[PDB]
Design a protein around this ligand. Sequence first.
Ligand code: 9CS
Ligand code: SAH
Length: 321
Amino acid sequence: GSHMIVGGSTIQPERVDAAALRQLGDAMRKVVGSADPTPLADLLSGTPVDPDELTREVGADGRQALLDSGMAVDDGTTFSSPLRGHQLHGVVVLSDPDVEEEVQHRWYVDPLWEADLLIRLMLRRGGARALDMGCGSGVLSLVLADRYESVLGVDVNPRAVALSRLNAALNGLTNVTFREGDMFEPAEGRFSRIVFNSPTNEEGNEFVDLLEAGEPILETFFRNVPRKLESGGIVEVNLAMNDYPGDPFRERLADWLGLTENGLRVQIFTSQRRATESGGEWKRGWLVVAPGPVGLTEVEWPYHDRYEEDPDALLDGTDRL
Ligand SMILES: NC[C@H]1O[C@H](O[C@H]2[C@H](O)[C@@H](O[C@H]3O[C@H](CO)[C@@H](O)[C@H](N)[C@H]3O)[C@H](N)C[C@@H]2N)[C@H](N)[C@@H](O)[C@@H]1O
Ligand SMILES: Nc1ncnc2c1ncn2[C@@H]1O[C@H](CSCC[C@H](N)C(=O)O)[C@@H](O)[C@H]1O
């Protein structure tokens, strides 16, 4: 048909018993991320697999649970999966494979481009109630679930809600809730923790799709953050920022947050930057709202480079700062 097919597959965990899902999840903990792929690990890496082999490893029920949830598809001979398995930070996560923009369905889910990294940037603290805006595959929500009494994930992509729910089910996590909706609209009450791996990269002000929504989505997030955040609470945001001549991002951010009016402390840790036509600058960085002296600070923290060199060096970094 048309070429934008990756990310349109039907995902339906509610079609399977939660016990079957937690068993499949247990099979996945054994083999996903381990070299010399078993049948199940190779299925979750995108290779066609004989169901005979797959059956010996997860059972006949496990084999049906893969088909009924949509984790696998029966060609005729073999089984294939439209998703990819990951195992990190104590959790097992499925998501779409990493592929080029041009073959991305409008419901394509973040293939975990920065999730492992952002999880290492996250303050290791815990508390009452966490929110994960744009939760995608649910990966950030599943991690936070370990140190928060409850976690709410929100995404406007109904495929990502289904996938998030599947992944929670695979890990047998019971304190995680996902809702479909537009930004804060289904997030009732306040939160002691808010995390946002934002849909922003090189699109500037332009809305391109659900993964690159333009600066307007950041303005909405940050304008509404003060009424969503508990006193003493913590916001963390992965984002792309654009500085234009006489028009720096950090100032637009201050207005959105009502920085002085709300008494907020905001630090931006900038990791990558490149000059643009307009004479201004593109940045990628990590923004944290946390308690302390009212104001906005910006530092250079090349955490993308230090990640390539030694990932565990990033643990408790924002705490040290
Ligand atoms: N190497 C090939 C890949 O290159 C691009 O991948 C980008 C990611 O997009 C970007 O992720 C960030 O930008 C997304 C929007 O682009 C946001 O939604 C997301 N929250 C945010 O973390 C990473 N930082 C860097 C990576 N090079 C393409 N997009 C992708 O199709 C392609 O396979
Ligand atoms: N208006 C909106 N309301 C809620 N989520 C939105 C949104 N617009 C885009 N998003 C979501 O924001 C997510 C950004 S990608 C990050 C996904 C996941 N948290 C991870 O780290 O891997 C996407 O899933 C996208 O669907």
